[PDB]
Structures are given as structure tokens and as C-alpha cells.
């Protein structure tokens, strides 16, 4: 059970750990990593220039899937 | 009455309808909330506001003890 690190790059590619994901494949990836434990914390980080519209699309996808424990990581 | 912190594309920021800056946001917030750090701060931003700006605001809030954040789109 490794920490879940979701990152969004400036070109809007996304990763869980080193595993590439998109908004359409992210939940399948998370569910495999967490064994469906929705109480897992999702630690989210993004490049400085990633915008609020992009962040909210990711947050909405996590939210609708029942991932309700989200930490935003700053540098 | 929920507290809404808004950040616009041009970097202007508001608590409710009242404008603030990064250096004045906490004193305004504390005056509004009676210093109750359990108040949820609702955050909304223009679509183009970037993560670096969001994190600066979140850090100012966190250092002041406001831990409960709700992001609205």
C-alpha cells in the first residue's frame, strides 16, 4: 500500500506515481492501486502553470468515484 | 454564512464581496470569522488561475490555521 501521488504536468499529461493516466483511465488505475479503499488519501501535485479548470476536472473525477480524502501538495 | 474566497484571472482576490490582497487576507478573514479556525473557507477561482497562485492562497490560509477548505467550480 504505497502512497498515492497524482501529478499533472504543464502539458496536462497526468500520472499516478510513474503510471500515465488520463481522466478516462484514472479511476481504474486508482481502484487497482487502493483495492477500492476510498479512505485512501490522494496526494495531488501539479506544475505551477496548471490551471484551475484542469485541477477541477481531476477533482471532479476523483469526487464522483468516491475518493473523498484529497491533499494538495505545494512546494 | 459561508466564507467565499474568490481569485480572479487578473489576480484580484475577494472575501465575499470585499477586495483583499495576500498580505491583508488573514486579518480580514479573522475579523469576519471571529477568529474561529473551524470555519470552512470556500475557494473559487477563474478557470485560468494557476496552481502556483492557488497554492500561495492555500499556504496563507494554512499558516493562519484555516484547515477546512472546499474547492468550488
Amino acid at each position: 500500500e504505497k502512497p498515492v501521488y497524482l501529478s499533472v504536468k504543464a502539458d496536462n499529461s497526468m500520472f499516478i506515481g510513474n503510471d500515465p493516466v488520463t481522466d478516462e483511465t484514472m479511476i481504474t488505475a486508482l481502484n487497482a492501486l487502493t483495492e477500492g479503499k476510498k479512505d485512501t488519501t490522494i496526494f495531488f501535485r501539479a506544475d505551477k502553470t496548471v490551471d484551475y479548470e484542469t485541477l477541477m476536472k481531476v477533482m471532479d473525477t476523483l469526487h464522483q468515484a468516491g475518493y473523498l480524502k484529497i491533499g494538495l501538495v505545494g512546494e | 454564512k459561508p466564507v467565499y474566497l474568490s481569485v480572479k484571472a487578473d489576480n484580484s482576490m475577494f472575501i465575499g464581496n470585499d477586495p483583499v490582497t495576500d498580505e491583508t487576507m488573514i486579518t480580514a478573514l479573522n475579523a469576519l470569522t471571529e477568529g474561529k479556525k473551524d470555519t470552512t473557507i470556500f475557494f473559487r477561482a477563474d478557470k485560468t488561475v494557476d496552481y502556483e497562485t492557488l497554492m500561495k492562497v492555500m499556504d496563507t490560509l494554512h499558516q493562519a490555521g484555516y484547515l477546512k477548505i472546499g474547492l468550488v467550480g
Binding site: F43, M56, M59, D60, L62, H63, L68, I70, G71, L72, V73, G74, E75 | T40, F42, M55, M58, D59, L61, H62, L67, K68, I69, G70, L71, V72
Partner: peptide
């Protein structure tokens, strides 16, 4: 409709 988050920094 809000998404509850925390801020995590080193």
C-alpha cells in the same frame, strides 16, 4: 458540490 481538500506542504 464543493470538493473538500487539505493542504500538505514539507
Amino acid at each position: 458540490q464543493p470538493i473538500s481538500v487539505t493542504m500538505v506542504t514539507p
